[PDB]
Amino acid sequence: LVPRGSHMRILITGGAGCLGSNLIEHWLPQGHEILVIDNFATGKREVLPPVAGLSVIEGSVTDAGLLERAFDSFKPTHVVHSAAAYKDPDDWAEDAATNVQGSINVAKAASKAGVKRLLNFQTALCYGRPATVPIPIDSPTAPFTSYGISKTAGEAFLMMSDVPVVSLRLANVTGPRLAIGPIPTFYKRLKAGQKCFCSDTVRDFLDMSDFLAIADLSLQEGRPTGVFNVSTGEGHSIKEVFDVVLDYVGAPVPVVAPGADDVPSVVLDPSKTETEFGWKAKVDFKDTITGQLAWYDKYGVTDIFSHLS
Amino acid sequence: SHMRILITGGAGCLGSNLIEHWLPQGHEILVIDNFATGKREVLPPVAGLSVIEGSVTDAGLLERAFDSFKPTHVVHSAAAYKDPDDWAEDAATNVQGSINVAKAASKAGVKRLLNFQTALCYGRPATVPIPIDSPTAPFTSYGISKTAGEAFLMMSDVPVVSLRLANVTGPRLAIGPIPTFYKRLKAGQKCFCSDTVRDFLDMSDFLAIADLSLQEGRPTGVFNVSTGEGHSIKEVFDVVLDYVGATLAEPVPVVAPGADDVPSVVLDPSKTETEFGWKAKVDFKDTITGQLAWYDKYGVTDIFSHLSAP
Ligand SMILES: NC(=O)c1ccc[n+]([C@@H]2O[C@H](COP(=O)([O-])OP(=O)(O)OC[C@H]3O[C@@H](n4cnc5c(N)ncnc54)[C@H](O)[C@@H]3O)[C@@H](O)[C@H]2O)c1
Ligand SMILES: NC(=O)c1ccc[n+]([C@@H]2O[C@H](COP(=O)([O-])OP(=O)(O)OC[C@H]3O[C@@H](n4cnc5c(N)ncnc54)[C@H](O)[C@@H]3O)[C@@H](O)[C@H]2O)c1
């Protein structure tokens, strides 16, 4: 039915997560039909209200039968693979099961169901310790943590599908219900008058609105396929992040090593994504950090505030 | 120097040749295998040799095996590959199986774990011979699952040696171009050579580095095992042709490789020579001739055992 001529029946694995839920808040108001499959390892049941257009199956991407049944009942036109395990770095079996096996299961099921487009999200940890920053899209994958290793094989399997597949390697996405990392940590701790530390690292940050726009483009029939970096292409230090928070909150911070497994600089080159999609990120660094903080002022550092009615 | 060796995949080509090398030495060996590709005939009921039929994907069975047998040493030689569209099995055996073996070895505090790795981990290399510090870049089910598996093994607290291998020839090799040219030439069938370059390694050179890899205080990490020299399939064909004595009715066509047939896969073994002091002794001609001599005695078979059964 609606949007007229481009209604999506969208199967989102990992839909109770940060990215999934934001995507849902973006697409459900437009009239798309969404089915979520989540096991609530990190995702919250509170971000999926019983609203029209939205169905939820509590389940794993590792469960191939649950997937065949969901894909058969629902008949998606489009798939967003957003399920990832990561929370216990020593539980390699879970990471392999979710991130590799779950990806293979989503890919085989998608293929059989004849989906039009599949959208995967990749971690920049796939790049390990890069030789060239900003990291070019044709850089080698070189992970050295469980999450990086399993995610890297997951993506590589997806890229063997006959289903058209877009895999976006992402900058740290800021937006509603981000409750981990330096931004909420400095906000909370500065407001509490606690000592903060800045790792001497460079990272890149992406506003939710820019993530939403490349996600939209990625699911359009006929658009490019393959692996793509999603970023402004600009890097900012953790100290720089801390500086925006301090100023915003209204309150001499030490700058320290690079811990062992803490990659000194991670910034992605988006140029090929700009070329093939006509996409460019609009919101700059200060507006990106400030908008996350503004959200914390309204709802607090929480992952359970729903913008759905 | 007595080893209690747990060898996953011991019924296959590498596993069984290793067992025939080590069992006469008084070593104690437990084989875990599911017989997907490897054969039951290569594992006679002999003193020193135990066989558990099972999967490396079975975490229960591995835990029970490492507990009862208490290995000092692990050789992870189990791999799935036969159906390139069966990604689930490849991921199950090669990634989950490797994690299971790694965790179990770590828990049992084994001294040394030895892994074998396919040169498909390198995908399409930028430089040939392939340097050890080259990126992994697999694009097939086998290569991607194996790449992830090796990477997990590398995160173990056990000392790990992962050997990236040239094509190993020896007892019971019954796949690839060598047995295919041998069989077809003797039967008067037309052969095709793709226009590819590969490396080949005699069993005796493989046995020598495997030995070194399981010695305490030896180097750890990833290593290329090879002579470092590359030979086309056409060169392989010529050795077989000459050896077999056949007369050709037509000159063999050399055809361009498929899209997924990597044109040149030769490994640079130089860090291995530096750190182990190992060097392959058997040249190309002798490597190929040695395989064909073995075929002449036993035929192209993967069920002939060199172990004396009671
Ligand atoms: N948010 C980012 O800045 C960022 C950066 C790089 C990559 N990514 C990728 O984007 C995706 C979403 O990330 P996020 O930030 O929303 O993380 P998240 O933890 O908020 O969401 C992942 C969701 O997957 C679910 N999940 C875990 N295992 C599952 C399984 N077996 N079956 C079904 N669901 C399962 C969790 O319950 C969770 O809701 C992940 O794949 C992640 O690797 C995100
Ligand atoms: N032969 C070579 O030149 C070569 C080259 C590169 C890499 N390797 C690697 O060396 C190892 C041995 O190779 P091979 O040449 O002996 O192949 P092979 O097929 O003869 O043996 C693999 C063995 O593993 C067994 N197996 C498969 N799945 C299993 C599982 N779930 N649990 C337990 N056993 C399982 C098979 O039955 C088989 O006996 C593999 O890891 C392979 O990737 C070999």
Residue numbers in the entry:
A (entry chain B): -6 to 244, 249 to 306
B (entry chain A): -1 to 308
What are the paper's exact sentences on this?
Soaking and co-crystallisation experiments with His6-WbmF and His6-WbmG revealed the binding mode for the nucleotide portion of the sugar nucleotide substrates of these enzymes. The X-ray data from a His6-WbmG crystal soaked with UDP-glucose revealed extra density that could be modelled as far as the α-phosphate. The location of this molecule is consistent with the nucleotide-binding site for SDR homologue structures and with the hydrogen-bonding chemistry expected to bind uridine. No density was visible corresponding to the hexose portion of the soaked compound nor the second phosphate, suggesting that either this portion of the molecule is disordered within the crystal, or the compound was partially hydrolysed and the smaller uridine monophosphate (UMP) preferentially soaked into the substrate-binding pocket. In either case, the data indicate that the glucose-1-phosphate moiety of UDP-glucose is not strongly bound in a single conformation by WbmG. In both structures the β-phosphate is coordinated by a conserved arginine, although the precise location of this phosphate is different in the two structures and both are inconsistent with the β-phosphate positions of bound substrate in the structure of a D128N, E129Q mutant of dTDP-glucose 4,6-dehydratase, DesIV, from S. venezuelae. Unusually, in WbmG the pi-stacking residue (Phe190) is the one that hydrogen bonds with the uracil N-3. S. venezuelae DesIV,23 and Pseudomonas aeruginosa WbpP,25 the hydrophobic contact is provided by the residue in the n + 2 position, whose backbone amide hydrogen bonds with the base's O2 group. This unusual feature of the substrate binding in WbmG could not have been predicted from sequence alignments alone.
The wbm locus contains three neighbouring SDR genes (wbmF, wbmG and wbmH), all of which have been annotated as nucleotide-sugar epimerases/dehydratases. WbmF, WbmG and WbmH are all homologous to Pfam01370 (NAD-dependent epimerase/dehydratase family). The abrogation or reduction of O-antigen expression as a result of wbmF, wbmG or wbmH mutations implicates all three genes in the biosynthesis of this molecule, and is consistent with the hypothesis that these three adjacent SDR genes catalyse the UDP-d-ManNAc3NAcA to UDP-l-GalNAc3NAcA conversion, which is probably required for O-antigen synthesis.
